[PDB]
């Protein structure tokens, strides 16, 4: 289900927030990630020698901490017997927190996406750079490696490299050694060679499409032998699929070994793509400003007022705002309100006296905005679009307009 997946992402994001905060005085913390294919024994051994080494650590508080963590991460791994699919992510240590409370913790879990990123570390802190880099890069891209020998269809995350389906074929010989039959055999060879392409072009629809919509934001075709092109520019390959043909890549090698080659030759394009789509969206946002229209908005005050009401269509936000939603509160009267304060206005501000009554209006702690949108953009109007300051249209959005706004579902006049 989609809702259960969104809960598991929120769970993991919250886990990361805590682990980045954690910290512990003295001590170290086992960052650890065991990729899908790995043998867990291999990990147990590694740990066991990492243990034996750590027993010569000169510092006590560090030593005994590290030994403890390694003792306990081994015990976690004992509860699994094969590596869970989609990898494993363990995070031992002895985190410190408020109240002077030294507490041990051992968070292991199969992460929801497969991942292809091993890591081991002892250091003062935990390392969750891998994990954030697997929530950021959703963008699944489809690969199809055509060759005279055979095909390979496969999907692709940031790091993760899946193999969907494949086959090979006995295509005919190049030549027909009779004078007349030469011509017929040629025409016949052309028919079976094309038929193979027809099969590939159907299979790709069968694999990379789902509910009359392609599941992959690109569709890299690869290979050699002027074949990938024969697919690329045919009437057989479905136009919604062929719309997202993103590259024809000439690879040496074929099949599985062909795959990796096809990805490394593709790397540059799949980066550009994410920026291209961003440029396109904001480009439209600006079109509504360029023409009078009315169906745009900008600056929290206006934008959220548009959201609250007959909502926006698309809401565009620069992926980090500073800007933060605070929940202000009164001591005596119990009257309360909420405000969207800038980095300067949030840090120190004499504004927040109650004035009418005459008391110090205390600001109960914040929830940072971009995250606030991410929580509850669905309870409004939808399509929360994170953007960047890399493109010229991107920067103009971030710099000028404030990296916040949205394309509206109809024309609205604003006042004050």
């Amino acid at each position: 289900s989609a809702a259960d997946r969104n809960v598991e992402i929120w769970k993991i994001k919250k886990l990361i927030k805590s682990l980045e905060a954690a910290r512990g005085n003295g001590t170290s913390m086992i960052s650890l990630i065991i990729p899908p294919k790995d043998q867990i024994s291999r990990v147990a051994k590694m740990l066991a020698d990492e243990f034996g080494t750590a027993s010569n650590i000169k510092s006590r508080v560090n030593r005994l901490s590290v030994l403890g963590a390694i003792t306990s991460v081994q015990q976690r791994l004992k509860l699994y017997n094969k590596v869970p699919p989609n990898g494993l992510v363990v995070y031992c240590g002895t985190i410190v927190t408020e109240e002077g409370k030294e507490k041990k913790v051992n968070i292991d879990f199969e992460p929801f996406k497969p991942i292809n990123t091993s890591l081991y570390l002892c250091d003062n802190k935990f390392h969750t750079e891998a994990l954030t880099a697997l929530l950021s890069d959703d963008s699944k891209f489809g690969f199809i490696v055509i060759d005279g020998s055979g095909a390979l269809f496969g999907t692709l995350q940031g790091n993760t490299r899946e193999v969907l389906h494949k086959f090979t074929v006995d295509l005919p010989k190049k030549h027909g050694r009779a004078a007349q039959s030469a011509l017929r055999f040629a025409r016949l060879r052309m028919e079976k060679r094309h038929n193979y392409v027809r099969k590939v072009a159907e299979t790709a629809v069968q694999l990379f499409i789902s509910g009359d919509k392609v599941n992959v934001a690109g569709l890299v075709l690869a290979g050699s032998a002027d074949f990938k092109t024969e697919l690329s520019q045919s009437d057989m390959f479905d136009q919604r699929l062929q719309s997202k043909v993103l590259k024809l890549v000439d690879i040496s090698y074929g099949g599985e070994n062909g795959f990796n080659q096809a990805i490394e030759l593709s790397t540059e394009v799949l980066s550009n793509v994410k920026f291209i789509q961003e440029k396109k969206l904001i480009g439209r946002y600006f079109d509504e400003i360029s023409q009078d229209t009315g169906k745009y908005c900008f600056g929290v005050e206006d934008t959220l007022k548009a959201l609250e009401m007959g909502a926006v269509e698309i809401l565009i936000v620069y992926e980090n705002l500073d800007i933060m939603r605070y929940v202000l509160h009164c001591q005596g009267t119990e009257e309360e309100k909420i405000l969207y304060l800038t980095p300067e206005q949030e840090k120190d501000k004499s504004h927040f006296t109650d004035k009418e009554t005459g008391q110090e209006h205390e600001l109960i702690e914040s929830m940072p905005l971009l995250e606030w949108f991410a929580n509850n953009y669905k309870k409004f109007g939808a399509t929360l679009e994170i953007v960047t300051d890399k493109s010229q249209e991107g920067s103009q959005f971030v710099k000028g307009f404030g990296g916040i706004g949205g394309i509206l579902r109809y024309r609205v006049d604003f006042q004050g």
Partner: protein, 163 residues
Amino acid sequence: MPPKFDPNEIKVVYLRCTGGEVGATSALAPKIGPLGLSPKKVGDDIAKATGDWKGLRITVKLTIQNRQAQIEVVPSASALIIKALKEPPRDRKKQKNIKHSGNITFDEIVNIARQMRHRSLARELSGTIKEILGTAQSVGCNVDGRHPHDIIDDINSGAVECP
């Protein structure tokens, strides 16, 4: 209010519908709200306080703006008052399956419903109004375990009491 910014008296009325609670998606103010001095969040909180504890299963909201003070009232819609006199109160979030139990009797309670009708209907008194509201019930299914349709034709009550 015509030329620039002048409240001569301002007893301006406009008819919003819906309002169990606040509503994030709201659509309460804009357009009509701000021009005319009525705000947005305060007007929403006042709208919540009026249509708080019953009705919480949809209402109506005529908003009489006394310059800056909005007067929210709950004018009755037949279907809304029938849903108010149902089997309360499982308000929101399960809920879910769904809001259509509809076996809650109301025999003499509907007499109150036809009485509170703002005259309306161009009726020949309650005898016909009974039929009207006695059908308006999409959910309720009339008395104990009855149908609406033709039991209505043999009414033997409240002809002279409702005026």
